Amino acid sequence: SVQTAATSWGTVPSIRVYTANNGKITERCFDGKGWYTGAFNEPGDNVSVTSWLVGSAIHIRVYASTGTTTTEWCFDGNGWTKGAYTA
Amino acid sequence: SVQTAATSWGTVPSIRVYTANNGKITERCFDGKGWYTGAFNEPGDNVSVTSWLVGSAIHIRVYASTGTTTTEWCFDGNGWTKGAYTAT
Amino acid sequence: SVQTAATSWGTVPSIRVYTANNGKITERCFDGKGWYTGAFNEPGDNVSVTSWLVGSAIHIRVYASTGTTTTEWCFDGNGWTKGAYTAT
Ligand SMILES: C[C@@H]1O[C@@H](O)[C@@H](O)[C@H](O)[C@@H]1O
Ligand SMILES: C[C@@H]1O[C@@H](O)[C@@H](O)[C@H](O)[C@@H]1O
Ligand SMILES: C[C@@H]1O[C@@H](O)[C@@H](O)[C@H](O)[C@@H]1O
């Protein structure tokens, strides 16, 4: 059974949904029209997400877990990079 | 055994908690007094949730998963309807 | 295999991550300069979280599930106390 996590910002709105399926996490996006595929693609059997705005600029943190190892992924306006989070 | 998801809005606050137990997702609600049962009741083994405020009016999106099938459910003031969401 | 839940607030920015591991939930904290361990430490196999501001002060509700039993934990400025939440 697949496992998901969701966040949203604004009032249009913008929505991001992350799905862990047979060890891989992918991203689906909504910005007021239809759903499309996002840039996020990394390993994980489990996922959680949060987001915040600084003025009108979006920041997303994805917590991806394989066994007992959790990796933080960071969106800050220019692709995804690894964050400093440890357990 | 059971899996939950939670969202909140305003300063009172209002809270909604969704629980996947025994093949069904059910909803519990708080608006400043006690907890009561909500209208949401649909099939699922896994659940996630997000929400946004339009003035004082809440909008809720619930993502219900069984196997490789994820169904989006939509609250916009007048009950729950299925959404256009599909996976990659 | 571990399960996590996350919440954030403000422009510090502030983040809280909860991890369920072998029936225990722990908390890691970010407030602008490195991660540290937080006060929350209670039983659970499954975890969800939500939070809201009153002025600039954070309030957090953590939903900790062991089997079919869900307990709500409450932060309102000074330590964690059990909440009134029960399931359908
Ligand atoms: C906010 C961003 O929106 C699109 O650019 C996606 O491709 C990214 O992964 C991210 O979700
Ligand atoms: C808000 C911060 O963004 C990056 O600096 C990450 O490396 C940190 O772990 C944190 O998520
Ligand atoms: C908002 C608070 O921040 C720190 O004091 C943590 O130790 C608490 O558990 C709580 O997360």
Ligand SMILES: C[C@@H]1O[C@@H](O)[C@@H](O)[C@H](O)[C@@H]1O
């Ligand atoms: C916002 C409220 O805070 C405390 O009163 C809890 O006992 C309730 O369950 C609710 O979470």
Ligand SMILES: C[C@@H]1O[C@H](O)[C@@H](O)[C@H](O)[C@@H]1O
């Ligand atoms: C915001 C709405 O509150 C109502 O009382 C509930 O019955 C709906 O399901 C929804 O949560």
Ligand SMILES: C[C@@H]1O[C@H](O)[C@@H](O)[C@H](O)[C@@H]1O
């Ligand atoms: C915000 C949008 O609401 C619509 O009713 C849904 O069908 C879309 O999938 C999306 O959630």
